[PDB]
From a paper:
As a proof of concept, we used this platform to identify both known and novel L- and D-amino acid peptide binders to the well-characterized model target, streptavidin. All peptides bind within or near the biotin binding pocket of streptavidin formed by two surface loops [1/2 (amino acids 22–28) and 3/4 (amino acids 42–52)], and by antiparallel β-sheets involved in an extensive polar interaction network, in which residues Ser88 and Thr90 of β-strand 6 play a major role. The surface loops of streptavidin are flexible: upon biotin binding they undergo a conformational change to form a closed conformation, but to accommodate the peptide ligands, loop 3/4 is dislocated by 13–16 Å from the biotin closed form to adopt a well-defined peptide-specific structure. All eight L- and D-peptides discovered in this work bind to the same pocket of streptavidin in distinctive binding modes suggesting (1) the rich malleability of L- and D-peptides and (2) the ability of streptavidin itself to adjust the flexible loop to accommodate multiple peptides with diverse sequences and conformations.
Author numbering:
A (entry chain B), C (entry chain B): 15 to 135
B (entry chain A), D (entry chain A): 16 to 136
The structure:
């Protein structure tokens, strides 16, 4: 699948990803330091039998920003596709939802994008 | 409050298990509950939400591949669980399809879903 | 076109819209009180020759949240389609971008949805 | 700083006029500048941004109809202008197509654009 490994976004984040034979994505977000206080679980899914016509591999994953040290009361989901080859990428759009009161729910979800590469920018 | 069967008003059912560790697992099911339309979901939620009336942040992914069908796509939902008398999961979603590089710009749809524990009539 | 008139979202907002023959959308956001302090200009575009196959009319508009009284340093864009008939609607997704420092730009854009009707909820 | 010609790295040109009143007007142009590919843009921007290093919030819409072509669609861009040595407009976009009611759920694509005043080679 080409997805298992360490991935870097363009803005100082690291993700350790494992792609299981069944379509499972597992792993962690890690800080640049790699310390336990900044480590969070990721879980998601990917297409384990992509098209053989040059198409990318659809996927998504979530991190809830709680570990045994910190809780931001929020969760990010990334949706995108893996593209293999010499310039392998995961191109994604993300949504970050924060836990809010009902009055503030309308402004609970931020949107953005991330591009993941196998080496640093 | 998250564990159980969630419905939108547009024909979808999700049977969700919320684990003590922050794991979301379960399935998408069609209205007829057939194996060909059943798909794995996995995600994460805040297992220690704020105690100030805020919702519980969460997200999950389904890759639309099972042993029968493969749409070469994946949906991620980002949102929050709101408890009380009329419990809800309020979400926004991204649907990414596997595409060629030329079509990657138009690979991600956006929308929203509102889920209830009450099966529609 | 069926678009000119007063429109209400589901959450206490009013928009006064004019659809020009050339594809122009003009008008204002108005508060429930209709006072000048809460009035802001909207401008956008719509498809002035939609398909005749039951399809909706694509459109979009922007409000920058500055008037002579107030400035939130932000702007909302709505993207969607008008659907005519007895239950006429404008179904939209929105993005709200706030002016931020470069360090906070990643969290400058909120996403949501609005449904507009010709009468109050 | 907004008035002028803006380019992405993906073949698009926008000639934007920022009026003293907060109006954005102008055109999309193709790389060959032909009339068949020219479309009106209109939007709004914050004409009195914060003086603390924050960007200038803005948005605009193009409905993809002119006297030659009609795609039955419209794009909205939401973002901010950032001045200085390498001025940019950083945006996220929504593209809504006119659809039947059955296809309305999949009528809106999401993405991002980064614009510069420097024409690509």
């Amino acid at each position: 699948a080409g997805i298992t490994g360490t991935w870097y976004n363009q803005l100082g984040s690291t993700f350790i990803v494992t792609a299981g034979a069944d379509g499972a994505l597992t792993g962690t977000y890690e800080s640049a330091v790699g310390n336990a206080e900044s480590r969070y679980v990721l879980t998601g899914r990917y297409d384990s039998a992509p098209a053989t016509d040059g198409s990318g591999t659809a996927l998504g994953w979530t991190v809830a920003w709680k570990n045994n040290y910190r809780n931001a009361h929020s969760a990010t989901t990334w949706s995108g596709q893996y593209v293999g080859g010499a310039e392998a990428r995961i191109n994604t759009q993300w949504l970050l939802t924060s836990g809010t009161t009902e009055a503030n729910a309308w402004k609970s979800t931020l949107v953005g994008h991330d591009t993941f590469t196998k080496v640093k920018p």
